[PDB]
Amino acid sequence: MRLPERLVEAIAESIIQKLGKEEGILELEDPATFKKKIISLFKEADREEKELEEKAKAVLRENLEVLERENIDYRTAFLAVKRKLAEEMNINVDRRERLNQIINRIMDLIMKDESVEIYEDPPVIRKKIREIVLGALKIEEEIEKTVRQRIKKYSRDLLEGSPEWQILWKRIYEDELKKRGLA
Template sequence: MKLPAKLVERIAGSIADELLKKHIVEADDEKKFREDIYNIISQAIEEEKQLEEEAERLVQEHMEILESEEIRYRTAVMKVKEKLAEERNIHLEPEERLNQIAHRIKRYLETEPSVEIFEEPNKIRRMVHERLKEIVKQEKEIDKEVRSRIKSYSRKILEGTPEWKILYSRIYEDALRRRGLL
């Protein structure tokens, strides 16, 4: 997930609101509760970001191998990322990753003394998972749109280059704004 902080804040707020307003949980300090949900999601996104950055750095260090073997940049990054994720017990398959994050939130709800839960923990996990799934679906659509726009340029811009990354970020943020997500 490549979600900007403002969008993560909206997601966390939406999950917290649903849990609180439907009286699924009760928190002694609602502000802290919202921050904790935000931090759990942010931490998961940061883990993925670090994984991606490390994989890209490792591939960049060995670009001569890619060129000599005619391996696509994205393919190489994904292979390295898969290996790093396996070592760190981070699921890359989106559905599994969302489930992993939903489990973290469930675990937090079960162990946080300032939060009382009034619903079956697995039911809460499923609800959180569904909310996260909606957001990731939007993120995938935006990513596909951004990549398509970059490919449509008359001049070929190679993925992984600084120019490609800057262009991707700019178009991605523009797509978020158009959809009212920023």
């Protein structure tokens, strides 16, 4: 589950408020563009995950006879093929390590941006941005936990994991985002 866009926006706003305005270790000429670039970074990371999934599907589609002949469940093969392609594409499949790659890309953006100056050792900036991103991940985890609790109510007449269940999950998720101002 990716971070919703308004939470990604909140990450960027938090970098500006804490590291810029409260601690003064970061200075930016253009906060709105800085936010835009961080949002693009998270969008691009999602585009990479989609490409990985489509590439994994395409590899499986050309090897269906292998799965049948060698008795390899499609679901197991997909996960294994996806992991291998991820290694080749340098995509970490754990959500946390993926976000860590994203923190490095944020640092790359900050350090290569001529309208940005930093008044601390770059790794110090990196660790503070990591704390902020982790904060957003903890919010997303708390939202997801609430969704799971709310959807359990419908266990009696709904198949857990069915397409309807997944759509209902997303509707409850959007409701929770609205209750927190994130949609």
